[PDB]
Symmetry: C3
Subunit: 268 residues, 3 copies
């Protein structure tokens, strides 16, 4: 009969509404669990002076110069001179071991990026008792923060775990091109880290055989490109959009049921 | 006349509805073609023992030791000893050529990551007849899987193409920091691959000139950080959301047409 | 009284509607500012011949050969021969300095990818007056474009800034595995760049002591895998979806107000 058919149609519409609700709930849960990633690139005319933390240990810093896009030939490799840069020593306890004390050297990085400003560091090591010579190094956002901070040690304990300390080797003029990655944690705070592309270049040993005992390290720190990579974890599980969608679907289903009832009545 | 104006308004609303339908269809097709990417990081207290597959060939494995965050100095480089690790040889046919037989060596990787556990491998090569000496290597998820698999050869034919085999050279204590990337294929299966950051460090030749003929290889395998990168291809082209949006728009347009008709009648 | 309660309910519904409108506006602005990223991998049976631009300078190109997945042993390192490849010299003004003139050499890269085709380049440098010997190099999409372009110099000024020029060092058979990243700029144009993974391998000096003065360079260019990474900045801030959502919410709110008024009248 017409009434039974209308009742069945209304029940089917109610079942469809319940299924739509279930699908929206499960999809909202899924989208909440899995935020999408948005990568943007910010133009910068001048980078904040990035702090470069080396750990020479027993290797003195022979030279620390600044240059623009090209390194001039060495007047006399292995001889100290031309410390035309700002440097600050420090000694800090390891955050993890808490016993070993690490002696770090903080150097101002290159500020100009459009001009390809770079910092050239020549170390030296004499009669090293340990094989596999290398110097660790790390990067943090601003040397000015290290300058003006109330306590400088705690800054280093924070940066040691905030960033990851790489290593560079002796006999290679390791060219380090840096870039900044700022990740939004969706908690009102952005974590800034350094992505460094290292290209090692061999060194020619033209020194006298006697001087071959000492092992020379060379490194260069510059800025890859004036792009800062902002990575934001966008969340598409917006409750208001889901509520609006569900209300629209419910109203459409109710009016479809009313249309079906009107059509059934008209047919009768 | 009022009737003509109402008819034109209703026709305009119908055209708007058709345009909305077309836009929704094309946007749904586009979103279906281009899924978005969601990157998440999973904390892990202990990594599954990762399998390191080397291909020494003619270079014997002088030493295979385990260490925690620091490599002790070599008592006597170039002298075998201290094989304090699990190793399994194997010979398998190349999946591509099917003729050349590769002799691989599977080593258990570092399990502890919070403690920075690492495996130190010292090989050696004597009177090498080939220039550009180096050893290939590759990584797969779990050495236990290789242990307990029914057929071990097929596991290697699968891993050779599933992962990409890198190379590490002689005279450099290549430091390999591993990380796991698990990509969801949206087919109920996740593909797990290794992203390895390599930092080479030169080696000091303090051996006698006569011993200089043999070439020594040194490599280290550890875990970068206790973070596993899950990359999921989220799909935003949800048919139910599109249907709900279209139904809501249709109902809104129908009621707008009815409001316009009522207003026209009231004006008359 | 019932009328006052109905008026308050209608006012509350209107306030909810205004809040929904504000939320939709702010969310649309946010989503417009932050597009999501979609990464897809396109299969390719054969890569377009990629153009490899070196800048040898004073380093002669001793050999430029092609090979399939394996480099045969050198018959006589440091001796020219076997230039079985296409090469084109050029001289162009630096886009930035505009004064220094760079002499570039364009070589056809490897076309076959399934067969692991690769190009092997052996240079040579004799009595170098500059320390830290190395040759720059860069990649652009197609060597055929450089062949058939009307002006070839302008192509180089475009590519120098479009891509980033890396460096490869002496004594290392730097193995360069290339991959293509095509980024959609949402402006009808796609920017194509090269991501190159470099694995350096030491070289054995078996040459006579007298020949040790000359420094030999070795490099290999191949294709990592037949996957092209398409990165598209998807935009989820679709105005039509927002309009449909808002219209659905408005209709639902108006009909809820009418339901409330009907219920109030029924109660009275
Ligand atoms: C875990 C989150 C948030 C927990 C909370 O805020 O209570 C999950 C658990 C259950 C989720 C709800 C499921 C269906 C809910 C009814 C609606 O058709 C619109 C989405 C709502 C309103 C969702 C809101 C949010 O997505 C919730 C609540
Ligand atoms: C290729 C896919 C899927 C093929 C299929 O499942 O038939 C495409 C081809 C045509 C696509 C349809 C276009 C408009 C359809 C009508 C609705 O206003 C809601 C989206 C619908 C329901 C879409 C569903 C899905 O997005 C489809 C079907
Ligand atoms: C800056 C953009 C685009 C500028 C423009 O096209 O005018 C911003 C500025 C204000 C934005 C509008 C805010 C609310 C608008 C009313 C609707 O409830 C649906 C979204 C609309 C239509 C939005 C469209 C677009 O998102 C706009 C217009």
């Amino acid at each position: 009969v017409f009434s039974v058919l209308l009742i069945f149609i209304y029940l089917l519409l109610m079942a469809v509404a319940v299924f739509l609700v279930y699908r929206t709930i499960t999809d909202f849960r899924e989208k909440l669990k899995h935020p999408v990633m948005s990568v943007s690139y910010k133009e910068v005319d001048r980078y904040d002076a990035p702090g470069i933390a080396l750990y020479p240990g027993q290797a003195q810093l022979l030279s620390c110069k600044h240059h623009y896009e090209v390194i001039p030939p060495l007047t006399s490799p292995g001889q100290p001179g031309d410390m035309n840069c700002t440097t600050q020593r420090i000694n800090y306890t390891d955050p993890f071991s808490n016993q070993t004390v690490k002696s770090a050297l903080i150097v101002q990085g290159p500020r100009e990026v459009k001009k390809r400003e770079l910092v050239f560091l020549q170390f030296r090591l004499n009669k090293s008792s340990e094989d596999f010579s290398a110097i660790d190094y790390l990067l943090f956002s601003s040397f000015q923060e290290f300058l003006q901070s109330p306590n400088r040690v705690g800054f280093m304990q924070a940066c040691e775990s905030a960033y990851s300390s790489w290593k560079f080797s002796g006999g290679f003029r390791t060219w380090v091109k840096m870039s900044l990655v700022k990740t939004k944690e969706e908690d009102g705070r952005e974590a800034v880290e350094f992505r460094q592309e290292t290209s090692v270049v061999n060194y020619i040993d033209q020194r006298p055989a006697a001087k071959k005992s000492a092992q020379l390290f060379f490194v260069v720190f510059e800025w890859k490109d004036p792009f800062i990579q902002k990575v934001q974890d966008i969340v598409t599980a917006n409750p208001w959009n889901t509520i609006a969608l569900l209300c629209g679907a419910f109203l459409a289903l109710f009016k479809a049921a009313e249309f079906a009832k009107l059509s059934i009545k008209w047919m009768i």
